[model samples]
Target: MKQDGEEGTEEDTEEKCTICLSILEEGEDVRRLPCMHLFHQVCVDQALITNKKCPICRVDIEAQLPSES
Candidate 1:
């Protein structure tokens, strides 16, 4: 075997988008959020426009408050 051991970032793989519950397309661009959840680009983009929380974990994608510096 090679010197490289199995890399386990999350020890899991993305099977599909939770929002649409659709399998990843051959051309779909998958994006990982700060919460470690992943989704299709278009799906997550539209959601972030109206919401900042991760669709799966409710974690804030952006780290800024309107009043906090």
Candidate 2:
């Protein structure tokens, strides 16, 4: 498997946030759910304020967050 920072030739990477339908640029802050859904960090934060699930798949978003100490 390729390590972190390794580039892949596959063209399957997401270029947009499914929530706000905004284009995601390289090096932009992003979050990925266990369901493999992608969203902008800001967009997801807003969504979490109203709904704790993915906007597209309705999967639990909090469950994917890094554990708090």
Provide backbone clash counts, one per model: 0, 0
Q: Write the per-residue lDDT of candidate 1 for residues 1-69, one digit (tens) a residue.
A: 788887644432355777777767556698777888778888888877778878768888864556531
Best lDDT among the predictions, by candidate number: 2
- After superposing candidate 2 on the true structure, give the runs of residues whose Cα lies further than 4 Å from its correct spot: 1-13, 64-69
lDDT of 2: 0.74
Q: What TM-score fits each model?
A: 0.61, 0.63
lDDT of 2 by residue, 1-69 (tens): 655784665553466888777678778899876667778888878887877777777777677457641
Local distance difference test values of all predictions, in order: 0.73, 0.74
| RMSD score of candidate 2 (Å) | 10.8
Tell me how far the alpha carbon of residue 68 in candidate 1 is from the true structure, in angstroms, after superposition: 14
Q: Note the residue pairs that clash in candidate 2.
A: none
